[PDB]
């Protein structure tokens, strides 16, 4: 439900900036804009995987909305990927969002 993935990323978004993440522009910077997304939204890769990727909110949001697939690995765009904050916490050493909540 296209609607129901439009209220999630409009509520389910945050604040991402360096000073609140703590993570490098880069780690933290959206693949669509590519640039700081200052209020954007952890949203997986691919749902039935660990990798979790950080986006733009109104970016990924209009991108849905286009009835696009999805940016990186052109899966169908759900709800179901659309995940919290403690889900995905930026570890250096794998240099992507891993999963705290599955």
């Known amino acids: 439900s296209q609607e129901s993935?439009?209220?999630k990323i409009s509520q389910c978004k945050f604040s991402?900036?360096?000073e609140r993440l703590q993570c490098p522009l880069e780690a933290i910077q959206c693949p669509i804009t590519l640039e700081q997304p200052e209020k954007g939204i952890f949203v997986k890769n691919s749902?039935?995987?660990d990798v979790c990727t950080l986006f733009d909110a109104a970016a990924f949001s209009?991108?849905?909305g286009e009835g696009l697939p999805h940016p990186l690995t052109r899966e169908p765009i759900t709800a179901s990927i659309i995940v919290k904050h403690?889900?995905?916490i930026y570890?250096?050493?794998r240099?992507?969002?891993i999963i705290k909540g599955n």
């Open 5 to 7: 993935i439009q209220n």
């Open 16 to 18: 991402v900036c360096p």
């Open 47 to 49: 749902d039935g995987s």
């Open 62 to 64: 209009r991108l849905v």
């Open 86 to 88: 403690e889900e995905c």
């Open 91 to 93: 570890d250096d050493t």
């Open 95 to 97: 240099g992507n969002f």
